[model samples]
Target: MQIYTSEKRGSDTAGNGTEEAPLKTVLQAIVKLDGKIEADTRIWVDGTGDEMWDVVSKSKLKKATKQYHIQTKKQEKAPHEKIVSYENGDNVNLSEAINVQLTLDTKLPEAKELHHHHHH
Candidate 1:
């Protein structure tokens, strides 16, 4: 799912994560995603002003096994500038772009595991 957030023109209760009616906060966008962090999943934030990107321990998200890009909205056909990214159970933080406190739920074990022995 493509989620959009805007501090200037957004609403948590009224918005549906669209450019026309974006969510008010990044937290809300993640809530709407419901732990489905896949290659096609994206969260786009407006690059106008300051906003919070807080993700605490209570915040729930599946391990980002696949690479996913979180970025700012671009002008015309310009490539979107990356705000953050995640891959292979890595934690992500947005302190570079905005004020944020992050604690990703990456400790969860994978669903499947196989034992492989190596010999010299």
Candidate 2:
């Protein structure tokens, strides 16, 4: 699972919840993957734009609160200090791609293998 702003290339129409073809909005993900999402599912999200806010504002997202084990961000840094240092959003360049990673736990090997391939 992944989240993208409407600005990202191939985000809207060409996504399938895969890393490369990451789902555009969290609302979309919740709708498409309602009950099937489990504790093993790691949901990646770009914390840059207002996409998340937009989803919350526009769509009702019937199953959003029910999503589980899906972290919003885990694999990448958001350049917090850099973005804040500029004070005027000058360091807002999204050159760095973000991702989410599943932590080692009671997760099955097969599920780990499947999610790990998103990086490879």
* lDDT measured at residue 7 in model 1 versus the true structure, 0 to 100: 54
- Per residue, candidate 2 scores C-alpha lDDT tens digits across 30-111 of 4443323344435555534754423232223334534422444233323221122221222233543322234444656455
User: How would you encode candidate 1's per-residue C-alpha lDDT over 43-120 as one tens digit per residue?
Assistant: 666653464332222222222211112432122222122234332233455464233334454543443334223321
Indicate the TM-score of model 1.
Answer: 0.37
Q: Kindly give the stretch of ten consecutive residues in candidate 2 with the minimal lDDT sum.
A: 81-90
Among the numbered candidates, top TM-score falls to 1
Error of 2 at 6 (Å): 7.7
RMSD values for the candidates in order, in angstroms, are 15.2, 15.6
User: Roughly what TM-score does model 2 have, to 2 decimal places?
Assistant: 0.32
Best by lDDT: 1
Q: Cα lDDT of all candidates, in order?
A: 0.47, 0.42
